[PDB]
Amino acid sequence: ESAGELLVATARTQARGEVLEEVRRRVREALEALPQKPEWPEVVRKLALEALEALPGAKALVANPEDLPHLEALARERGVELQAEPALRLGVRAVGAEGKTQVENSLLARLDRAWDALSSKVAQALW
Amino acid sequence: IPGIRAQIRFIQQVLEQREREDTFRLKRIKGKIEAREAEEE
């Protein structure tokens, strides 16, 4: 009977899922390729600025040592401290004044937080 | 016999409900007393 149309439906859904996962893979590759290019310091500075703005008061600013020279300008100007850490790349992380809150602005996390909403737009664009 | 059974069930439910209410009141009062002790000793 027409119950065999389930095969067509599941095939279509599985193909769409594979396409979306490939799009995500390419996005992750592009993200990890950003720091190598010269345009990375400004985006990281903006990320750190937003992270600080999210804290009513930040005790310190945390980023990988390769970013510390680029973030020193904001760190000293904003008056907050700073410390090196093998933290997540592609962004900067903030620590609350009391030391019990923490805001992270990594792009590898922003992608995870934005994929659920962006999936509909990406699917519309693809098809 | 069904009538007596129904009456027994009704009275059992009433008594159990009253016991539950008493226990809940005791617990709430005890918790309030503990909070008062913690806040002001």
Added chain:
Amino acid sequence: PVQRKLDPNTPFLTGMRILDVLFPVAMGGTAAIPGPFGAGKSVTQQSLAKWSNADVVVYVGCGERGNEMTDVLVEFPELTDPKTGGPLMHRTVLIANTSNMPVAAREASIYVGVTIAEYFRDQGFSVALMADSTSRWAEALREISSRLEEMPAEEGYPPYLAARLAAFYERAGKVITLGGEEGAVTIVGAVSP
């Protein structure tokens, strides 16, 4: 405020034989209609709204089904007032706070309905106020008292429940208004034990 309280002497004809004959309620009186679910509380209340001899009918939907307020909104405009001859909805005021609406608002709904009824009484009318369920007002009181962390009386209800119900039901009566006219408020309240 009122000028005087009078002794009820005229009937509040509900249009139902059992209530009108065996258990009458006067125009300044009060009545409770408790019953288990499926017994016909809502049909009786709507019948009182449809056929009563009251100048103005104030219906209060405290924490009851919303379909029962849609029923009134959709049917009353097509029905005729027993006396005035115009649309029935023209003599009706609806206060709706359904079961899925905010819990704290049930108390406010009771009080708003009673105040509107008292106002129309002050104009010199005979007002019928129907409370769809006072048990839900009691539930709202219980929830708020739970948040206030108060000690409960029987079945979790705050000990001041009887006082609230009394203040509500004692706003009924045939009175001589401050303007010298005569008016009344009949309260028929429904309990959902």
Added chain:
Amino acid sequence: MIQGVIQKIAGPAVIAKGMLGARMYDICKVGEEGLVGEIIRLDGDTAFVQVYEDTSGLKVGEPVVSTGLPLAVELGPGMLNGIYDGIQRPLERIREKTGIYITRGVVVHALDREKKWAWTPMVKPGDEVRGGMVLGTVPEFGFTHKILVPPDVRGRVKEVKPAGEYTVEEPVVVLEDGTELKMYHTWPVRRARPVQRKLDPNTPFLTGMRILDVLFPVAMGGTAAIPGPFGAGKSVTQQSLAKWSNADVVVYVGCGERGNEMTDVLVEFPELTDPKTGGPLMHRTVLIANTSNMPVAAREASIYVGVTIAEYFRDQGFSVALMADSTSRWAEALREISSRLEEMPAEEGYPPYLAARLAAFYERAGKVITLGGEEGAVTIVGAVSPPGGDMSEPVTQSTLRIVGAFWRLDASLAFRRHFPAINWNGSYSLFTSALDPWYRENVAEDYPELRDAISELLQREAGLQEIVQLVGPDALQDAERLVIEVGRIIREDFLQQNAYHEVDAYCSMKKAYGIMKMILAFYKEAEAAIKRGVSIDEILQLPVLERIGRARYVSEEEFPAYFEEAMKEIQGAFKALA
């Protein structure tokens, strides 16, 4: 390892300091004696520990050390033929080391660490392994015990030890990552073991008892409940189920039973003989034994330990029969624990989450496709013994909401020397509709209709009791007397079963179908005769009734002959009879 110091002692409840980092529901060792407890609360730098054993003699300042793992069971070779507590403590070794009393803080390993096992590897270096796959094999009595990769382990094999005799602790497969896979692994008792897919109740669990296998069947992977009246022969029925069922392994959980009832269980099972092999049945059984004076934590964890062991043997690819005795006692233990935690009681003092826990226990049963791709099942038969026998009790009501079959053992039948003492007017099964196709393919195409006819006859005979009581059987007319007597024949020749007989102790579905068909054919011919005018007193004298009387006692290899012969003689009797 997290270490602290006792701050407050009040009954079984101990508060510990310096316990920052301790995890919820971890197992902790309290005091110098190392008494085992469970972390039930965390507050600042403190942890609330509820100690299983008595805390007399403890002092403030004594050390509290956290193990870091929750309540877990050791799963591996050496569990069969074992007698354990509610927390998997081998009782024979405790007796050997401590006497006739159980002392505080007796540390003994579940699996013996000195016995050697014959290891036959089934993997080679470079093979990939995933959770549930079979690394190797070991012979345990009559069982090809499969050693399984723990469900949360993956990697590429590096070293596989050769064949030989090894202790359970010895690494036997070392993965490229470095993980060392021993012959056993620990699993939490409150976490259901992973599986690929749960299947449907399509196939039956053959208990070997006619009444249960026909009128109130339980599917492989299903759940059943029996009430334990005194004098109803519950123990004999349970033992017969253990002996004659199609389960490859039997797990028996006593979760708070009386001292002498547990003595009876522990003295009788070792004397039970496995029909499949003739050796002891305990070679195929695991016993969890708890008395009412043992710690409350043990009594609460008994059923979880039992179900975890059953799930392990299921993953090995077996069908396991789990028989929890007096889940009411387990509910009492749960009630006591909840009371000590200062929780709100619901209904008869039971915690509000009694039904949820009972459901989570009963619904680890089911026929499954294991992580290794094999097929196994766990069937649960829990016993509900309310103190007064009232069925409105919360435990019985919660159980009946979740189980698929209810077999009402009744003492009244046992008083009438009817065994098994199962009442067919209060019992029910919710599996028959799902099991119909299996019956149509495996026993006979008309078996369901015959079973329905037998049920209808029993119902009719129940309806006629109000007349037989006022006026004896002799007064009833011929048709009603035929109904009464076909009911007697059913009760005596199909529903009764002597558990101590050589042949009648076990009945196959074919044997039951044959007996039912004979009875119904006799009833049809007898109705015809009564409509022809033959007095019923003449019908009851036929020797064919005597032949139907002995059908129970004919062997399985002989029953077919007996069966067609008796059918022919049934047709002969009434045709010949005038």
Added chain:
Amino acid sequence: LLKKEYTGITYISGPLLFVENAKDLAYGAIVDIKDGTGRVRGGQVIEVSEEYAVIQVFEETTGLDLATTSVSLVEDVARLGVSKEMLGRRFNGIGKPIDGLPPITPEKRLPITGLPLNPVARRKPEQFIQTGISTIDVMNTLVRGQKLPIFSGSGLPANEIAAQIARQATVRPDLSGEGEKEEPFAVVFAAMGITQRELSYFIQEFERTGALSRSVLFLNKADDPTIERILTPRMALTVAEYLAFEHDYHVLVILTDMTNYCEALREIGAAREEIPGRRGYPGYMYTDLATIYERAGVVEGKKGSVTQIPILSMPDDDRTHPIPDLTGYITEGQIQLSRELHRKGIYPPIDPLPSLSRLMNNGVGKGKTREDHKQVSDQLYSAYANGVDIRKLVAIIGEDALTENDRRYLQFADAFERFFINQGQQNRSIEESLQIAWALLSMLPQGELKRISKDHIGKYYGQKLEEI
């Protein structure tokens, strides 16, 4: 798009945990609790103050500590991604797939609590759903947009009745006048801690009828956490409302074992130490159940509809239990099942006397089936009540002491149970059910039918029990 983590856990006890400097956690906000193992589990903010925030975890708290645990913010409001592609999928009770297919691409993200329907925006449920079961179609008619639960017992076949209603329910536009083309039902099935057996039955039936292609399944099993049991019906009804009032669907929602929902509610309320009600159930259980049931209905200016058939097992077979009582005050009637009829072998075992449909009168009559429907129903109720009364009397004084009138009423009651209630799996048209009803009424004198007008009695009285 910023991930804010809070590591100030102060107190973990049972299902609750407290976080200190969490002033930026909204009330009702969904959080994410991460442990040292990296395991990620969710919870909800149930109280927030300047001192701490109270979070209730949707699963057990095993493995939580105050050193390595952290809570992050998922959303300020509990939301569910929805689409028209949910049809044909299976979910976990939180929303995640269990069918192996890739996750859904959300067209919108709607709050799961929903919002109350404005009483001015609803229209009156009018359309008649022919369930194929006479006891419902003639006596307890189900109208589209109605919430009509099934009151069942411990071992009675309510799941079978729900499956049969799903398979057979139709609209019958020919009687209504329009004669429109068929508009099949979409089915949203929510499970609240069911056994594998009931789930297997349901899946097998839906596969047999090909319903899964137009169904959404939310499955919370007995092995799943009890706290998540509260989210499942809200997810199901959010999906149903989205479909009905954004894509003009007619959704039939089946919520199975609402008693499990109420047990989970009681467990949570006991944990929170709230003022209880009648048997330990929270004082707000009526409001919580209303927030679920009231989400059904029909909206003015839209073509879709959401109709609900909750299934709850009355504990110990008593209406006066809090769960059936509070459901009765909310729902628009109830279809109660009888253990006696079940023991006699009658399927579906629906006892008319304790069963009611409040919205019956708005969906039966001229242009809404047949003009004799309501009077026939009332006459059947009166006659069956008389028969039951005389059956009670006969159990005391026997049959010989009866009048001819009483004997006719007993025979009517027995024939009613044997032919009207007992129909097996057969799908009956409304006309067939009314024909059987009139044949049963024909067993009584033509002057005992006080509820039927003389015209209808003339029109239909006379047929014998010969339906085939």
Added chain:
Amino acid sequence: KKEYTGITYISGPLLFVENAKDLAYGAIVDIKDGTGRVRGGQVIEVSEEYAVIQVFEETTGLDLATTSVSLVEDVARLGVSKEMLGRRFNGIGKPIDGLPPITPEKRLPITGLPLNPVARRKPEQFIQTGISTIDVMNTLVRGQKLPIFSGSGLPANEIAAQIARQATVRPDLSGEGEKEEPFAVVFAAMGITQRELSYFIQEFERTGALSRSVLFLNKADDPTIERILTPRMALTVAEYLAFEHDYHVLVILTDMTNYCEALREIGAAREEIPGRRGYPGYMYTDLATIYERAGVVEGKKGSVTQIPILSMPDDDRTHPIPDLTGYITEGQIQLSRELHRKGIYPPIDPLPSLSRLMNNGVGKGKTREDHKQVSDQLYSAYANGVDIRKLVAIIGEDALTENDRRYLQFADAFERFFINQGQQNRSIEESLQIAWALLSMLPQGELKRISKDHIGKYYGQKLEEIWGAP
């Protein structure tokens, strides 16, 4: 030795002591005031901030300035020895007989350890109580727990004293037997009055039963902690004797209702939310710790047998105390108010009485081969007799069948001769003889529960053997 004077709170039975982290949980402490009086107490909660002492007796003279606390023992312990036989103690072990104190062979904790369930053995030997309604119909087996359910004003104390004076083992009935089998009775009286104390002293001293008994007598005005400790000390002595000197010990606990009320009072004293009907949610565990301490162990020749006596609060078998006791024990001997007020002593109603383990301890090699069937026939005959006795009030005797009248006469004779034995002491042989004499009053043929061999062997005795000297 060491004294703690940092007392900071007195209220009710509790006392808070500061800087007492050396005190172990559960310790026993002496409390001294200015007058020099010394009170006892138990440490019930120890914390860094303070320790909580539950004071035995009352606090009618204590003050924060002068009171001090000192340590007696880390764990409640009892010094035991075989010289306890013939002695009377007070629930904490202090002698109250006027004799010097005992010299303990060892000192043993009173919260005894659980018995390993693999060490236990199936009860198979009976102990003769001397009362026919128990020996023949509700037999008591070694290692059994068979409580006596009594009422408000029924003579349970007298029955307890009689069982104490008459209890014996019967090796002669078990094959070749053994040259000797020591027997002892432990007697725990919880919450008794001065009247009952005098009665027990006199009964034990007037027949020489003291020489084989140990008495732990707790009065009603004595402290409640003493009431809770009394059964534990009794069972500690019983286990000592049984499993270290091969005695057969019979433990009689006089009033378990008083124990449970004491438990409730102390639970409230320790600030615990009560459970069902006001009793602690852990009452089941405590009652199991008391009861489950009896049994027979493998490889040991001794045994501990228990007879808990409890008064049903309102003749209600569903009250928590009788309910849990039945849910943990192995039968019940129930006393009858009707039989009591008709003059029958001891008033045991056979119909509601049961002994689960009876079938193991009766038969060949123990009692007699006809025991079980005689008991079943007696039960059935008495039931029919009672039913017919109620029917005759309506239908009259002339409308009954002859068999019915025989059952009527059997019921009358059964009540007058089997249940009503007074202070006599009956061996199992005498009881079985009376049973067969009573059964002879029914036609041989209505005895459907007894095999023909036993009938031919024993049927036909004359009731004059007992009717001539009841």
Added chain:
Amino acid sequence: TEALLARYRERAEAEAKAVREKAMARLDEAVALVLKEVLP
């Protein structure tokens, strides 16, 4: 008969291929959209 199921299998394979081929054209633009929406 099984012929219908085989036909549906062929149709499903064709549909999956068509979806993949259609997607292959615009994938880079989708990546650009995601990058624009994820960056600050």
